[PDB]
Amino acid sequence: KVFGRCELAAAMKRHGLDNYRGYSLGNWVCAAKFESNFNTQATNRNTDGSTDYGILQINSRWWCNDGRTPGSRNLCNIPCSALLSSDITASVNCAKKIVSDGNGMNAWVAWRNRCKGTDVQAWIRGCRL
Numbered sequence: 001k002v003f004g005r006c007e008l009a010a011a012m013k014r015h016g017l018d019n020y021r022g023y024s025l026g027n028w029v030c031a032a033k034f035e036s037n038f039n040t041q042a043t044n045r046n047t048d049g050s051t052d053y054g055i056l057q058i059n060s061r062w063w064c065n066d067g068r069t070p071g072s073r074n075l076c077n078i079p080c081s082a083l084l085s086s087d088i089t090a091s092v093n094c095a096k097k098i099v100s101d102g103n104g105m106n107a108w109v110a111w112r113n114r115c116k117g118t119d120v121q122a123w124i125r126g127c128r129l
Protein backbone atom coordinates (compact mmCIF):
# COMPACT_ATOMS: atom_id res chain seq x y z
CA LYS A 1 0.00 0.00 0.00
CA VAL A 2 1.20 3.50 -0.79
CA PHE A 3 -0.19 5.76 1.92
CA GLY A 4 -1.21 9.31 1.32
CA ARG A 5 0.56 11.82 3.54
CA CYS A 6 -2.38 12.74 5.78
CA GLU A 7 -3.61 9.14 5.63
CA LEU A 8 -0.33 7.99 7.15
CA ALA A 9 -0.31 10.84 9.68
CA ALA A 10 -3.76 9.78 10.90
CA ALA A 11 -2.75 6.13 11.18
CA MET A 12 0.45 6.96 13.04
CA LYS A 13 -1.44 9.25 15.43
CA ARG A 14 -4.09 6.65 16.10
CA HIS A 15 -1.37 4.13 16.94
CA GLY A 16 0.20 6.51 19.45
CA LEU A 17 3.31 7.70 17.59
CA ASP A 18 2.52 11.42 17.90
CA ASN A 19 5.01 12.72 20.47
CA TYR A 20 6.13 9.18 21.28
CA ARG A 21 9.48 9.49 23.09
CA GLY A 22 9.01 13.21 22.47
CA TYR A 23 8.98 13.00 18.66
CA SER A 24 6.13 14.97 17.13
CA LEU A 25 4.01 13.44 14.39
CA GLY A 26 5.74 15.35 11.60
CA ASN A 27 9.03 13.69 12.49
CA TRP A 28 7.48 10.26 11.90
CA VAL A 29 5.78 11.27 8.66
CA CYS A 30 9.01 12.83 7.36
CA ALA A 31 10.94 9.70 8.32
CA ALA A 32 8.48 7.46 6.47
CA LYS A 33 8.54 9.70 3.42
CA PHE A 34 12.28 9.46 2.97
CA GLU A 35 12.66 5.87 4.22
CA SER A 36 9.96 4.28 2.06
CA ASN A 37 8.10 6.98 0.12
CA PHE A 38 5.07 5.88 2.18
CA ASN A 39 5.16 2.40 0.55
CA THR A 40 4.46 -0.41 3.00
CA GLN A 41 6.07 -2.96 0.66
CA ALA A 42 9.49 -1.26 0.43
CA THR A 43 12.54 -3.46 1.00
CA ASN A 44 16.22 -2.57 0.71
CA ARG A 45 19.34 -4.66 1.20
CA ASN A 46 22.20 -3.43 3.38
CA THR A 47 25.90 -4.12 2.91
CA ASP A 48 26.10 -6.23 6.08
CA GLY A 49 23.58 -8.70 4.59
CA SER A 50 20.61 -7.39 6.51
CA THR A 51 17.49 -5.93 4.88
CA ASP A 52 15.26 -2.99 5.79
CA TYR A 53 11.52 -3.61 5.71
CA GLY A 54 8.40 -1.56 5.30
CA ILE A 55 7.15 1.95 5.73
CA LEU A 56 9.80 2.71 8.37
CA GLN A 57 12.59 0.53 6.90
CA ILE A 58 13.13 -1.60 9.98
CA ASN A 59 16.38 -3.53 9.87
CA SER A 60 16.66 -7.33 10.17
CA ARG A 61 20.07 -7.11 11.87
CA TRP A 62 18.34 -5.99 15.07
CA TRP A 63 14.59 -5.91 14.96
CA CYS A 64 12.88 -8.64 12.94
CA ASN A 65 13.55 -12.12 11.62
CA ASP A 66 13.97 -12.73 7.90
CA GLY A 67 15.91 -16.00 8.16
CA ARG A 68 18.84 -14.75 6.11
CA THR A 69 20.62 -12.30 8.39
CA PRO A 70 22.86 -14.72 10.33
CA GLY A 71 24.02 -13.53 13.75
CA SER A 72 21.18 -11.01 13.95
CA ARG A 73 18.67 -10.22 16.65
CA ASN A 74 14.86 -10.16 16.48
CA LEU A 75 14.16 -7.63 19.19
CA CYS A 76 10.62 -6.88 18.01
CA ASN A 77 9.92 -10.63 17.97
CA ILE A 78 8.29 -10.52 14.55
CA PRO A 79 8.89 -11.91 11.06
CA CYS A 80 10.18 -9.12 8.85
CA SER A 81 7.41 -9.83 6.34
CA ALA A 82 4.90 -8.65 8.98
CA LEU A 83 6.50 -5.23 8.60
CA LEU A 84 5.34 -5.14 4.95
CA SER A 85 1.62 -5.29 5.79
CA SER A 86 -0.89 -2.68 4.63
CA ASP A 87 -1.81 -2.36 8.32
CA ILE A 88 1.04 -0.45 9.99
CA THR A 89 0.40 -1.79 13.51
CA ALA A 90 3.43 -4.11 13.61
CA SER A 91 5.76 -1.46 12.19
CA VAL A 92 4.56 1.14 14.69
CA ASN A 93 4.87 -1.22 17.66
CA CYS A 94 8.37 -2.14 16.58
CA ALA A 95 9.33 1.50 15.88
CA LYS A 96 8.35 2.34 19.46
CA LYS A 97 10.94 -0.18 20.70
CA ILE A 98 13.57 1.14 18.27
CA VAL A 99 13.19 4.79 19.21
CA SER A 100 13.38 3.81 22.89
CA ASP A 101 16.68 1.93 22.56
CA GLY A 102 19.07 4.82 23.22
CA ASN A 103 19.59 6.78 20.00
CA GLY A 104 16.10 8.09 19.54
CA MET A 105 15.15 8.71 15.94
CA ASN A 106 18.80 8.72 14.85
CA ALA A 107 18.13 5.01 14.24
CA TRP A 108 16.55 6.20 10.98
CA VAL A 109 19.38 7.47 8.82
CA ALA A 110 17.03 9.29 6.45
CA TRP A 111 15.45 11.04 9.44
CA ARG A 112 18.82 12.17 10.72
CA ASN A 113 19.99 13.42 7.33
CA ARG A 114 16.76 14.85 5.92
CA CYS A 115 14.28 15.53 8.75
CA LYS A 116 16.21 16.29 11.94
CA GLY A 117 16.29 20.00 12.64
CA THR A 118 13.93 20.88 9.79
CA ASP A 119 10.36 22.22 9.84
CA VAL A 120 8.82 18.78 10.26
CA GLN A 121 5.35 20.08 11.19
CA ALA A 122 4.97 20.97 7.49
CA TRP A 123 4.58 17.23 6.88
CA ILE A 124 1.16 17.32 8.55
CA ARG A 125 -0.01 20.57 6.95
CA GLY A 126 -3.65 20.43 5.87
CA CYS A 127 -4.38 17.18 7.70
CA ARG A 128 -7.42 17.12 9.92
CA LEU A 129 -6.12 14.80 12.65
Ligand SMILES: CC(=O)N[C@@H]1[C@@H](O)[C@H](O[C@@H]2O[C@H](CO)[C@@H](O[C@@H]3O[C@H](CO)[C@@H](O[C@@H]4O[C@H](CO)[C@@H](O)[C@H](O)[C@H]4NC(C)=O)[C@H](O)[C@H]3NC(C)=O)[C@H](O)[C@H]2NC(C)=O)[C@@H](CO)O[C@H]1O
Nearest residue numbers: 046052056057058059061062063098101102103107108109
Ligand atom coordinates in the same frame (compact mmCIF):
# COMPACT_ATOMS: atom_id res chain seq x y z
C1 LIG B 1 24.48 1.71 5.43
C2 LIG B 1 23.38 2.24 6.31
O1 LIG B 1 23.55 3.19 7.06
N1 LIG B 1 22.21 1.60 6.23
C3 LIG B 1 21.05 1.98 7.02
C4 LIG B 1 20.77 0.94 8.10
O2 LIG B 1 21.91 0.85 8.94
C5 LIG B 1 19.54 1.32 8.90
O3 LIG B 1 18.81 0.35 9.76
C6 LIG B 1 19.50 0.71 10.91
O4 LIG B 1 20.66 -0.04 11.04
C7 LIG B 1 21.49 0.49 12.08
C8 LIG B 1 22.83 -0.19 11.98
O5 LIG B 1 22.74 -1.59 12.18
C9 LIG B 1 20.80 0.30 13.43
O6 LIG B 1 21.54 1.00 14.36
C10 LIG B 1 22.00 0.30 15.46
O7 LIG B 1 20.90 0.04 16.33
C11 LIG B 1 21.27 -0.69 17.50
C12 LIG B 1 19.99 -1.07 18.21
O8 LIG B 1 19.30 0.07 18.68
C13 LIG B 1 22.21 0.17 18.34
O9 LIG B 1 22.54 -0.45 19.52
C14 LIG B 1 22.14 0.22 20.67
O10 LIG B 1 23.04 1.27 20.96
C15 LIG B 1 22.65 2.04 22.10
C16 LIG B 1 23.58 3.23 22.17
O11 LIG B 1 24.94 2.81 22.24
C17 LIG B 1 22.71 1.16 23.34
O12 LIG B 1 22.33 1.92 24.48
C18 LIG B 1 21.78 -0.03 23.15
O13 LIG B 1 21.90 -0.93 24.25
C19 LIG B 1 22.09 -0.77 21.85
N2 LIG B 1 21.11 -1.81 21.61
C20 LIG B 1 21.42 -3.11 21.50
C21 LIG B 1 20.28 -4.04 21.26
O14 LIG B 1 22.58 -3.51 21.60
C22 LIG B 1 23.44 0.51 17.51
O15 LIG B 1 24.28 1.41 18.23
C23 LIG B 1 23.05 1.15 16.19
N3 LIG B 1 24.22 1.35 15.35
C24 LIG B 1 24.44 2.48 14.67
C25 LIG B 1 25.70 2.52 13.85
O16 LIG B 1 23.67 3.43 14.72
C26 LIG B 1 19.40 0.91 13.42
O17 LIG B 1 18.64 0.47 14.55
C27 LIG B 1 18.63 0.51 12.16
N4 LIG B 1 17.40 1.28 12.05
C28 LIG B 1 16.20 0.72 11.91
C29 LIG B 1 15.05 1.65 11.77
O18 LIG B 1 16.05 -0.50 11.91
C30 LIG B 1 18.35 1.64 7.99
C31 LIG B 1 17.19 2.25 8.73
O19 LIG B 1 16.01 2.28 7.94
O20 LIG B 1 18.73 2.58 6.97
C32 LIG B 1 19.82 2.16 6.16
O21 LIG B 1 20.08 3.09 5.16
Ligand SMILES: [Cl-]
Nearest residue numbers: 004005033038
Ligand atom coordinates in the same frame (compact mmCIF):
# COMPACT_ATOMS: atom_id res chain seq x y z
CL1 LIG C 1 4.37 13.67 0.24
Ligand SMILES: [Cl-]
Nearest residue numbers: 067068069070
Ligand atom coordinates in the same frame (compact mmCIF):
# COMPACT_ATOMS: atom_id res chain seq x y z
CL1 LIG D 1 18.34 -14.62 10.47
Ligand SMILES: [Cl-]
Nearest residue numbers: 109110113114
Ligand atom coordinates in the same frame (compact mmCIF):
# COMPACT_ATOMS: atom_id res chain seq x y z
CL1 LIG E 1 19.98 9.74 4.13
Ligand SMILES: [Cl-]
Nearest residue numbers: 024025026121
Ligand atom coordinates in the same frame (compact mmCIF):
# COMPACT_ATOMS: atom_id res chain seq x y z
CL1 LIG F 1 4.95 17.92 13.93
Ligand code: NA
Nearest residue numbers: 060064072073
Ligand atom coordinates in the same frame (compact mmCIF):
# COMPACT_ATOMS: atom_id res chain seq x y z
NA1 NA G 1 17.08 -10.62 12.58
